[PDB]
Amino acid sequence: KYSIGLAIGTNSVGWAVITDEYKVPSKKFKVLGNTDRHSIKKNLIGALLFDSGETAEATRLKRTARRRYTRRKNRILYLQEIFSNEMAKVDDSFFHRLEESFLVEEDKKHERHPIFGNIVDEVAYHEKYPTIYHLRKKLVDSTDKADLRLIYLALAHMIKFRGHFLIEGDLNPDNLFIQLVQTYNQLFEENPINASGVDAKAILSARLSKSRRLENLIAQLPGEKKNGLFGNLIALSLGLTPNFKSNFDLAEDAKLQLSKDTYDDDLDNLLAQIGDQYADLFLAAKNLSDAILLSDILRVNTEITKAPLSASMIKRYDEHHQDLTLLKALVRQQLPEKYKEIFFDQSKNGYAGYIDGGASQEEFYKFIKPILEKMDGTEELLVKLNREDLLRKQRTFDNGSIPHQIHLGELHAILRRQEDFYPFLKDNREKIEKILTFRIPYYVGPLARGNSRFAWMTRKSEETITPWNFEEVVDKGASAQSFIERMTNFDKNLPNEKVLPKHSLLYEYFTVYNELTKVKYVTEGMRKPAFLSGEQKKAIVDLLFKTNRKVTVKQLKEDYFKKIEEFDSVEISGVEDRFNASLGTYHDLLKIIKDKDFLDNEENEDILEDIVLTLTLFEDREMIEERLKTYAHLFDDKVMKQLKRRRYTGWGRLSRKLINGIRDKQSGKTILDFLKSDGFANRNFMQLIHDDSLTFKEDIQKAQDSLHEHIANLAGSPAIKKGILQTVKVVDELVKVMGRHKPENIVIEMARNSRERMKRIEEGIKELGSQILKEHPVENTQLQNEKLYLYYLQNGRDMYVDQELDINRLSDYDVDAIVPQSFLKDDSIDNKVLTRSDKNRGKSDNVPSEEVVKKMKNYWRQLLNAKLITQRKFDNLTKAERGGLSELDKAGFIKRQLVETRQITKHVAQILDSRMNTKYDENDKLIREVKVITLKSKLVSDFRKDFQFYKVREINNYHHAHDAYLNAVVGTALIKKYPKLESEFVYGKATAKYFFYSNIMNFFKTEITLANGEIRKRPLIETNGETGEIVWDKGRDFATVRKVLSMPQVNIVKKTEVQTGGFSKESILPKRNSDKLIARKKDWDPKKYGGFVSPTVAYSVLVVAKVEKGKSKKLKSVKELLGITIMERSSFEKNPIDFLEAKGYKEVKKDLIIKLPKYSLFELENGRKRMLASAGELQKGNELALPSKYVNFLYLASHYEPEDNEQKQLFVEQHKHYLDEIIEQISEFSKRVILADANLDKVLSAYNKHRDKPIREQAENIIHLFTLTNLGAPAAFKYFDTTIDRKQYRSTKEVLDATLIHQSITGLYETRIDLSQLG
RNA sequence: GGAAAUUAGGUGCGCUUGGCGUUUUAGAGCUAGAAAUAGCAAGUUAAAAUAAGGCUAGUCCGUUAUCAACUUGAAAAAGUG
DNA sequence: CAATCTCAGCCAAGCGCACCTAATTTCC
DNA sequence: TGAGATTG
Ligand SMILES: [K+]
Ligand SMILES: [K+]
Ligand SMILES: [K+]
Ligand SMILES: [K+]
Ligand SMILES: [K+]
Ligand SMILES: [K+]
Ligand SMILES: [K+]
Ligand SMILES: [K+]
Ligand SMILES: [K+]
Ligand SMILES: [K+]
Ligand SMILES: [K+]
Ligand SMILES: [Mg+2]
Ligand SMILES: [Mg+2]
Ligand SMILES: [Mg+2]
């Protein structure tokens, strides 16, 4: 008889076997191999450790980048093939010189000047066109016939770096304010605005923040304020999104943004409230928006050139030239000694490091700003620097905002200019434009032909896909439909039927009637509440749901029960405040098609389901239009135009066949039929499909993956999922260890941004319109501090008092839990706030008091509408106005502290239970031979603290194994003592439940001082009340637990793993002579071209062979560890002997080759162990088994800050000698297996310096000292403020004559190989 | 233990795109001097590569998951204390 | 050799589906 | 945290 405890973590599976006396057995296991040792004794406790499992995300991002480099290359190849025949007439090696431009002169086949093949023409080109943008602008604007090579380069530059696809439709740069002002002045005839003299271009296109230009513009309009109507508008032409609630005395918030696709509908929503007369106001706002949309990137008047982007780059270049000339002149006059540093030293962040070295524009500015402020005549240079507009390059990090339409306009213009001289440019103009503009639709995916596991695209024609034949060769419709249909759920009830669109009319009718049919009403004179009849539900749907998007309970009472039923008073149950379900799509389509009778006519149901399906399935408006054309004769062209813009996303949970297809045989009614009208029973969906007197249940019944696949397909981090599969393998091994007898119980416990924080605070303060970021700028790395993050999330105010907080006094402020942490175990931002003093929350018993909620609710709602708090956080803050925390709330919170509710942990329980329990009884009921028990970590955590079995994670890895053991002990004892708990813990009144779960663990204790101010005593022996069988003996089972935790032999196994992933570090380093550099392409010698460093070793191999020595090349026998790199691995595995001989080995002992992945384990002298870090470095291989008295002493001494504390304090003082004893434990261990005497000397030295320090601080820093002794990779650590750097073991030679240890997953089965016998 | 709806927040898998960076080459450096060097001039741009590569030859695929040893099997797998 | 110093690809956009958690109404 | 290079 035995049980298994398991502790499942992100990097470990702890495990232990226990008997019915809570003991861990030990056993002799066979030892295989070639050593002296035939067997060894092992305790049945241990922990498997592993590197974290990784998600597929990084791999996915690299796969996308590969496709985009492939396709970018093909864009150029398309362009060159078009130019091929005519370029051969001008210069038959021009494309060859382009392709070999990277090669050193000695390697080149053609002359080294790429464009023209000779130095005088090449020099003349750069003199006339210092940047590509000079050429582009020249070719756009000039009427001269141009050299075909210069045409090619300009078009290639645009196609290769073609700009983004975030703006739909066409752009035509044309560089209105007088009219809009005159418009507003007319539409508000009594309150006009005078805009005479206002330079609207200079104010709005200023480089400043949009929030600032609003101020500047309004400053020029006396009588207008920034929050006035015209002020709120200026942001619309600008690009912000403000709310016009107070402008029009509105009741609901209504904002608008021109670039959003919802603009025409929100403007329609707003105009319906404010009146059609306001059409010309937002219309003139939209007209002005066109000419100044691209003013951020186009800084040139579009009347003097058709290439304002290139002209803007040229303006960068010219100002750079002018300002560089000035900067050099000023420096020569005032600071000459700095000239050499600024303009020659590439290692400094001056101009030299900016141009030739590695200084970014940001690092260059910071370096040169104090030099500018120090000198005279640099006022204009300083303004440009602060505008981030000084000595600018033209290829820069901020060019991501250029839309492809801008590059397209210059491309089109060059083609128009030069097609007059080259007929092939006229015949291929649209082809070339297609190369720039064509984008593979994301709903089509990779253009594969049977060899891509990622692709779903299908072809209308079996031929090669180009940008010009894409629409004709690819079946866009089938591919877009496949895109969605491969992913969407089927109806679990009818598993061959796809779920309906979430926005289907039928689906929403289903939702509305399912909710409505369970409403009840009662009025004075009714004996009892009544369901609504079919006729009343139809009246409510027709009168309320089909006239209002949302239906409140007040409208139900006033507009139905008063108006129709003639009730003055009525009590409603089944719905609170408002119905959750609504007919959103009905009202959407009513606005569009303006034909209520059409919507209400049942004969149109198929048409309208197909329309919404098309609007849900497809995202492309032209594909939607194409698919809607069967219905074109039904609607006006104007309606059709609005319908194709009405997109929906999202899928329901149920199919059309289920909700309104299958019929009950006796009645002939569908499910929706019953929801509309079901006598006086009003059965809802759950009742209908479970009712044995209907045929829905049997028809749903008639309509109705390996382990690794199953685990992989679970929701939850790939990290925790790695531990789950290892857990199953640990259990399988332990069962085999136990003679294939199954355990009685298996007890399982499963363990429980900087950029994102800045984005939430930026987006949230922009929503509030607050200037807190301007007053108190922050860096994303700072927002990792809890109190500073809360400060900005609360707009610098107290959450419980209507007052600002002082940002420089956060150490005096409190972080309080909204729901007190004594009830719920939430320490996240969603349950914490920053307040001056937590006493102002109200009482500590509950949620923040009612008075606080009354005062702060409106301020809390503004944070909620800014997403600075979540809805969950708001509901907990305002809970007091809904009764606060009730008695059931408290019981549930204490229950949830005990009973695991996570689905992922239930999945682990289910997996183990279905692997252990496989037999059925006489009633075909499952036979539960093994009870799978799930515990939360708090149970064992409190057990450890209550009975002084303390845990110090930094000492070694044993705490994972000790956890699993205590899980087994506490879990089996718990259900032995209270077998009724099995419903709660085994897979397969309010105050009383509160008191019960608060005291369920009392039976372990002898004397319990209850919270009720009383003390209770229990006997030495705890028993089950029904059976009398002994469960716990406080005179022997606690000592047994001590004998378990103090055992030094714990099977800790670091999972050996082949390394995978990137070939090497990614940086391309410049050329050097060191043979370390790796070629980036087959024929790119790193001595000429640079290359990569640091290949990653996939695994090492032991090689016993011979190598050639000296000029004589005489053969010498060697035994070596060879690191096989990731890049080499396929070639090595394809033919190991041929690979090894190419490396220089001869007469390899083929049968002696040993594959040695990372963490391969070796034992040397005196028990010292090492693991392979690679082929050239080792890791520490031992665990320091510190005695239990020292572990408990460290815990108590390090946590020095009931009246048992005085007893714990006295114990620390009486055992002050343990500190030196622990240092001697570390020293002996380190001298035996660590062998880092310089670091150890530095540690003993540092420990002697601080013997005068308080005991708590010494014990605190002693815990750090175990980094020297820990298993695994060496790592630096600190003792007080003396830093000990790491000692790496950068030689593997010694393991070549050591003992190699192959371990099974538990480490219980070993094969030991004495490598000294090899050679 | 489940289901539908509402509200909100997370996570995973997949697709399509934009901008940098880096590397080598091209962008005639000048004057003095035998040279070492010194005094100046100049600088903003481009091509090409962006896992080596692969066969299945596609505008495809190439970094996730999974892995002690031994044995009988090329392989999948199965067995061994 | 050792001890010590040094280094590490990054920033951004849009879209689809599927899960999970946590509160509310109604049910099985 | 493996490993390239420089300093001792
Ligand atoms: K040559
Ligand atoms: K004003
Ligand atoms: K550089
Ligand atoms: K630079
Ligand atoms: K560049
Ligand atoms: K409601
Ligand atoms: K859609
Ligand atoms: K029509
Ligand atoms: K892997
Ligand atoms: K990895
Ligand atoms: K292993
Ligand atoms: Mg790119
Ligand atoms: Mg390639
Ligand atoms: Mg570049």
Short mmCIF file of C-alpha atoms in Angstrom, two decimals, chain A residues 87 271 386 466 505 598 779 825 992 1019 1136:
data_model
loop_
_atom_site.label_atom_id
_atom_site.label_comp_id
_atom_site.label_asym_id
_atom_site.label_seq_id
_atom_site.Cartn_x
_atom_site.Cartn_y
_atom_site.Cartn_z
CA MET A 87 18.61 46.77 -70.13
CA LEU A 271 -26.42 63.97 -36.37
CA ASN A 386 14.59 69.60 -29.13
CA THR A 466 2.37 36.35 -59.66
CA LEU A 505 -30.72 37.45 -36.47
CA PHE A 598 -38.87 43.26 -44.81
CA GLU A 779 10.41 55.69 -18.12
CA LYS A 825 -5.49 35.77 -2.39
CA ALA A 992 -21.19 27.22 9.29
CA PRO A 1019 -5.90 13.90 21.86
CA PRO A 1136 28.83 10.32 -38.37
#
